[PDB]
């Protein structure tokens, strides 16, 4: 009984540190969102051809956007809880080889298999995806972000330089960083309800 009591308190503290880590990761995803919003805005106006031209006055916008994508790379790399990188591909959900998931096993209980598995990914290439992102699209819509000259060519009907596809993939990036950020809030709810179980059963 003592074993399970003390280990159950320590299981609470384990879950609590888990909350903390997740809060850090998620904060990095907050600033990720704000940046991607800026990006989306820059894309909308950069898709306001007819007035937003000179094409080097899109180069300037491109430069800005490329700086923002560099910041997404930054956040994905420098985000660390006790030195441990999270957002980068270390913690992919499920590759074609499930032997290389490397989940975030948290210890949650004072006994065997009372654990939670968590995964996380995003970086510059966090745009649309099927198993990998894609080639000409779906990652460089978050790394390269066309509008260098590459909208004055064509408008909506090219699928790799058209506004509709590009912006759509920004909306995918927002949607799936939003999705990843939406899992982990629920994970925090899991851990709070858990700690309530741990204090009750503990008592």
């Amino acid at each position: 009984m003592r074993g399970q009591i003390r280990g159950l308190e320590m299981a609470s503290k384990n879950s609590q540190d888990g909350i903390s880590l997740i809060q850090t990761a998620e904060g990095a995803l907050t600033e990720t969102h704000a940046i991607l919003q800026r990006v989306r805005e820059l894309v909308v106006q950069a898709g306001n051809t007819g007035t937003q031209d000179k094409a080097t006055d899109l180069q300037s916008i491109q430069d800005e956007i490329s700086a923002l994508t560099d910041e997404i790379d930054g956040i994905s790399n420098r985000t660390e809880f006790n030195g441990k990188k999270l957002l980068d591909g270390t913690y992919k959900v499920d590759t074609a080889t499930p032997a290389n998931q490397k989940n975030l096993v948290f210890q949650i209980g004072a006994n065997a298999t009372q654990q939670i598995s968590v995964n996380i990914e995003d970086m510059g290439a966090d745009a649309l995806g099927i198993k990998e992102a894609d080639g000409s699209i779906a990652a460089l819509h978050s790394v390269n972000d066309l509008d260098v000259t590459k909208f004055a060519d064509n408008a909506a009907d090219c699928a790799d330089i058209g506004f509709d596809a590009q912006l759509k993939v920004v909306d995918e990036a927002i949607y799936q960083v939003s999705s990843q950020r939406a899992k982990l809030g629920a994970v925090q709810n899991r851990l709070e309800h858990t700690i309530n179980n741990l204090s009750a059963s503990g008592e």
Binding site: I19, I22, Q23, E26, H33, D171, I174, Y175, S178, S179, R181, A182, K183, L184, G185, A186, V187, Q188, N189, E192, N196, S199, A200, G202, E203
Partner: protein, 49 residues
Amino acid sequence: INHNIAALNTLNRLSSNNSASQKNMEKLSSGLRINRAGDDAAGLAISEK
């Protein structure tokens, strides 16, 4: 009975109500219910879009 007082529940209600005044501290001092994603993921997923 002495070596383990039975008002350990009191520690849990203190560490929950104290833990909740502070959720209202973060939630008030920014105006946002989804200050922290662990309040409602749905409202985040919608509100972002």
